[PDB]
Amino acid sequence: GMNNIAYIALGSNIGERYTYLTEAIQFLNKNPYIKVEDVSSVYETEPVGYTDQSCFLNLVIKISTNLSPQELLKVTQKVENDLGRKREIRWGPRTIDLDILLYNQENIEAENLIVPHPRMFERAFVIVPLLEINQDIKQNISRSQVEEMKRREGVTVWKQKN
Ligand SMILES: CC1(C)Nc2nc(N)[nH]c(=O)c2N=C1C(=O)NCCN1CC[C@@H](SC[C@H]2O[C@@H](n3cnc4c(N)ncnc43)[C@H](O)[C@@H]2O)C[C@@H]1C(=O)O
Question: Which residues line ligand 1 (CB under 6 A)?
Answer without folding.
Answer: 11, 45-50, 56, 58, 91, 97, 99-100, 112-115, 117, 119, 125
